[PDB]
Write a protein that binds this DNA or RNA. Structure first.
Ligand SMILES: [Mg+2]
Ligand SMILES: [Mg+2]
Ligand SMILES: [Mg+2]
Ligand SMILES: [Mg+2]
Lengths: 190, 138, 199, 175
RNA sequence: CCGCGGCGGUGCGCCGCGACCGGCUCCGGGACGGCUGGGAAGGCCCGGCGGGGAAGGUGGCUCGGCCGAGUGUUACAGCCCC
RNA sequence: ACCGAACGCCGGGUUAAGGCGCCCGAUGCCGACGCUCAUCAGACCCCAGAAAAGGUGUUGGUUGAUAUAGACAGCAGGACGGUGGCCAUGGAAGUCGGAAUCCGCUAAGGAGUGUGUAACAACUCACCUGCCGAAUCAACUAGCCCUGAAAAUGGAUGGCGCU
RNA sequence: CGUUCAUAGCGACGUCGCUUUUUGAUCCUUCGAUGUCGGCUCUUCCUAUCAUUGUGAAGCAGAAUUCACCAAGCGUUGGAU
RNA sequence: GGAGCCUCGGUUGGCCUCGGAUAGCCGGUCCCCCGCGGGGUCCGGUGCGGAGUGCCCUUCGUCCUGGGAAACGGGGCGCGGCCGGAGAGGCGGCCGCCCCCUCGCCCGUCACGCACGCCGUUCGUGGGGAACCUGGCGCUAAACCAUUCGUAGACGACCUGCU
């Protein structure tokens, strides 16, 4: 049935500053701004406290599917904060049985060519979601690092290069080839 | 980003229904969409009234969630709600909207004459202010 | 004597209804910025529903067929004509009073243009429901002149900003002028607030 | 039966007396029904399912309205049922929150219409019992057990949609 | 011929009014009966007698300027309720 | 051929059956309470169309459970000995099958859920802890929605449309 | 059944359906006549998908392959009797 | 400027922000950035919307004279220059010069067929279309046929040629 009120907090830390224009959380801090519009979610984003210490997301008269956003908004706001403070670093190892997967970034972290996958003449040029930047790793051999503030943009850009490296017409139980995302992390821990 | 809330003891103007144009202090919320309501001073009986009709004011007098009429009456008369209402812009622009409606066809004419003139004395002053702002710009 | 309704933010068949009935009573109606009009239910849904309508056609000679207009203006005008008696003379006479537009062009760009709230999305849909914009729906179904309509309308809104700004300035002058003048208009303004204005 | 808004009726009745039962036992029933004429019918229907006692065998002694002695209070009714399905019969127990037993009974019927498409003739009310704040099982009702109960009024959709059928102003729903 | 006196029937054409009766369709007033000789309520309060939510209270914590606000616990009546 | 109602010519009033976004007379009520979203929604006697069986889609019920004696999930720790237990040898030491089906140590582990073995081994699946910290889970049932659901000219809740 | 393993692919005993490219039932329509089979030619429609596009499945290592989806865009041939 | 058929509707205008809806509207910036404006923050106001389409504007008898409040406003289809407007512009705005007037608001002061109780009155209106009388300044044809051609062709059509 309808539920007279559900709500939730988010402790923004002192390192970060957050604002909100209406229903459009804006988060800035160390690494830069990160906005996100929540027009489409029908909630009362009460930012409250002196020192602006926490965001609070109401939801009056929610039925089951309505309430379930409440958390998800809050969760998106943590992850905003996280990227502002720490950043996101999605590591992805290359895995191949024979043909080594030659990777080479181009513009900066934007382009990703991926030659000699399965011996294929075709090179997989993969742009990034803008805001992200790939790089190759040193220290660990067959391994990329996708650093970025926006989790979404990072992960998406990861997937992109995960998906580029698929095999057609063969048995993927056997043919375990490609770049795949090994670890989801941050740029600096604290 | 809400401000007026359905509370116990919140005063509500009744937009429409039987008791339209009357204030009423919610005693208690029965249901999702229905409140048990009172208007001791305002000439409204202890009765259930749905929210549909009762648009609600900035006032909230303070008594207990299930009062016994005497006590919400006392609360009302203490806070002088009926005075405070009547000095609100809202209740004034109700009265305004009442007084245009009452207007006799003679009064109507009177008014018409008045505004005819009252607009003229502004429009000239506006003209001047425009002429003087043009001189400043030059 | 003319109804000018801003088609924006209405529900396709909801506004059509009102318009139809008006148009039959002999009110010359102009709807405008139809591409703003938005149809209830989600997009994919409605695109599919337009795509049915394009599937319809006389086999032997398509040329004779149900004339699927693509322009969101026409599309609205088609759905009024579905709520009229258009084979008769009186229905065709009515339909000649309705005037519709893809965006909002020169005779009615400078007109106070109404809204019907009974057709209004923000009133008739629950806020947790999806809805197509007609503009999109036309677009994907074959309408050309989206960008052109848009890019004229930026130029309309810029020009309107200016008009509004200058209105605001006159309103501020009036307010100031009444404050300058008040004492010599006191025994008018008083009477207008004894007979229910100004308050 | 049908509906409108029910009342309560106290019907009482007895198999009318013979040589072999000179002072037969009266029976009483809380009928809930839109009027006394049907109340009495309804009474019989129930009696006959229980006792061997038909209208023609009997009489109704006293049928009369029953008023809520606590109108201006608000109360939580539990209410026990025995409806019918498109399949077989079930029993239930629902809770409503109303100013009058009648109110809550009516408020039940309606719900059953909505939540189960159960028509009136399908339904038997077996008891209606005003209850405390506690003992209430249904958290639908229990979210209204609060002293500092508060809530906004949020997307307050306008009615009077045809007063001004056409107008200048796009409306406003924030209050 | 003037009386348009009294009566009778008429109007060239278009109209309007009035009061009476028939029928409807609504409106506004008032006066009454019954009931669980209605149920609740209101108003004056007094004497007792208990029970519960939960309080001018206290307490752990939080948020603001000893005071105000928000949660929490045992719970008398100095908020009420039964 | 249903439902209403049965016919001289008309004025006023009222109805039935059915209706009242617009086509189309009437809801242009501030009508009431729910339910429901369909990338095939649904939308009214006769009637012109679907079933069994499914669905953590949602909304109600019913009955059991659980549980501060410290849970529920989530990760972490162990999962044994009498014992190749008996029958079956083709090999079944828990593990093609089948009759059995108890005790010890127990904190606790079945003569054993699976995976895998020619057969083992190895792996896997209770009872309890640590972080954790108040409620949580199962089986039924029925309402709307969905899956089940394929035909030929383009097409028909009468149409437009309606959330 | 499928070394094993109910459900990769199958599916008995049972059961529920859809379809009108089979045949029956039927006899409403036409007997003051709707030209009675094939093939030829031509168009279009359907999908219940053989092929091709993009895909999930396997008892898919590759090759070949079945099983299923979106899908009727484009094709689907020459001859002996 | 004069008549004179016909076609009819009408019977104050509204000269414009964008948009939002779990929000908006307006101010003013003390202060900061951008091109008198735009953006920002901060503060102050409204917000069942009064800087409200529940609204705004406009008045609806005519004239006289003889006081007040208000007062340089209005006109002569007054006349010349400078603008803005292209989405289907079709409308404004702003600047010189000539002549005339005393309009709105209150009052005094009379008079205007007062047509004798009674209907299509009251306007957009010099309306749309057709035929007729005046001045001023401008104008000076193509098309079809026939003839020809063959880029064409059933016939028409088409494509070309001819002081
Ligand atoms: Mg087997
Ligand atoms: Mg034939
Ligand atoms: Mg298919
Ligand atoms: Mg293969």
């Amino acid at each position: 049935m309808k539920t007279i009120l559900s709500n939730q907090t988010v402790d923004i830390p002192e390192n970060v500053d957050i604002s909100l224009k209406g229903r459009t959380v804006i988060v800035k801090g160390p690494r830069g701004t990160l906005r996100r519009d929540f027009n489409h979610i029908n909630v009362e984003l009460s930012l409250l406290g002196k020192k602006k210490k926490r965001l609070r997301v109401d939801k009056w008269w929610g039925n089951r599917k309505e309430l379930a956003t409440v958390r998800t908004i809050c969760s998106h706001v943590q992850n905003m904060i996280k990227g502002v403070t720490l950043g996101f670093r999605y590591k992805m190892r290359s895995v191949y049985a024979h043909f080594p997967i030659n990777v080479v970034i181009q513009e900066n972290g934007s382009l990703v060519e991926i030659r000699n996958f399965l011996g294929e003449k075709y090179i997989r040029r993969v742009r990034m979601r803008p805001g992200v930047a790939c790089s190759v790793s040193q220290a660990q051999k067959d391994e990329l690092v996708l650093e970025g503030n926006d989790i979404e943009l990072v992960s998406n850009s990861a997937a992109l290069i995960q998906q580029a490296t698929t095999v057609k017409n063969k048995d993927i139980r056997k043919f375990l080839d490609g770049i795949y995302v090994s670890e989801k992390g941050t740029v600096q821990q604290a | 980003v809400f401000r007026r809330f359905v509370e116990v003891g919140r005063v509500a103007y009744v937009s429409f229904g039987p008791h339209a144009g009357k204030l009423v202090a919610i005693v208690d919320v029965i249901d999702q969409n229905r409140a048990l309501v009172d208007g001791p001073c305002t000439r409204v009986r202890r009765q259930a009234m749905p929210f549909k009709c009762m648009q609600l004011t900035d006032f909230i007098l303070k008594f207990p969630h299930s009062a016994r009429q005497k006590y919400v009456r006392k609360a009302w008369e203490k806070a002088d709600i009926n005075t405070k209402w009547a000095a609100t812009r809202w209740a004034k622009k109700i009265e305004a909207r009442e007084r245009k409606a009452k207007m006799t066809d003679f009064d109507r004419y009177k008014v018409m004459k008045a505004k005819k003139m009252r607009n003229r004395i502004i429009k000239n002053e506006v003209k001047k202010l425009q002429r003087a702002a043009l001189l400043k710009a030059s | 004597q003319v109804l000018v309704l801003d088609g924006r933010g209405h529900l396709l068949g909801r506004l059509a209804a009102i318009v139809a009935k008006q148009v039959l009573l002999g009110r010359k109606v102009v709807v405008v910025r139809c591409e703003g009009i938005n149809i209830s239910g989600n997009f994919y849904r409605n695109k599919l529903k337009y795509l049915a309508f394009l599937r319809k056609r006389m086999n032997t000679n398509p040329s004779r067929g149900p004339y699927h207009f693509r322009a969101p203006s026409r599309i609205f005008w088609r759905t009024v004509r579905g709520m009229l008696p258009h084979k008769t003379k009186r229905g065709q006479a009515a339909l000649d009073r309705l005037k519709v537009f893809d965006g909002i062009p020169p005779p009615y760009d400078k007109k106070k243009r109404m809204v019907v709230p009974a057709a209004l999305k923000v009133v008739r849909l629950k806020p947790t429901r999806k809805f197509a914009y007609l503009g999109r729906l036309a677009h994907e179904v074959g309408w050309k002149y989206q960008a052109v309509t848009a890019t004229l309308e930026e130029k309309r809104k810029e020009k309107a900003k200016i008009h509004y700004r200058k209105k605001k300035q006159l309103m501020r002058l009036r307010k100031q002028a009444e404050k300058n003048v008040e004492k010599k208009i006191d025994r008018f303004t008083e009477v207008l607030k004894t007979h229910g204005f100004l308050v | 039966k049908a509906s409108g808004t029910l009342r309560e009726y106290k019907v009482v009745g007895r198999c009318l007396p013979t040589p072999k039962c000179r002072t037969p036992p009266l029976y009483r029933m809380r009928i809930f029904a839109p009027n006394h004429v049907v109340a009495k019918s309804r009474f019989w229907y129930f009696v006959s399912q229980l006792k061997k006692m038909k209208k023609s065998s009997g009489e109704i002694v006293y049928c009369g309205q029953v008023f809520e002695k606590s109108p201006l209070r608000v109360k939580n009714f539990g209410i026990w049922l025995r409806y019918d399905s498109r399949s077989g019969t079930h029993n239930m127990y629902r809770e409503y929150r109303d100013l009058t037993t009648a109110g809550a009974v009516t408020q039940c019927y309606r719900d059953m219409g909505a939540r189960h498409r159960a028509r009136a003739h399908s339904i038997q009310i077996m008891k209606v019992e005003e209850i405390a704040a506690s003992k209430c099982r249904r958290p639908a009702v229990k979210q209204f057990h609060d002293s500092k109960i508060k809530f906004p009024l949020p997307h307050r959709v306008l009615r009077r949609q045809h007063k001004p059928r056409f107008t200048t102003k796009r409306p406003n729903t924030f209050f």
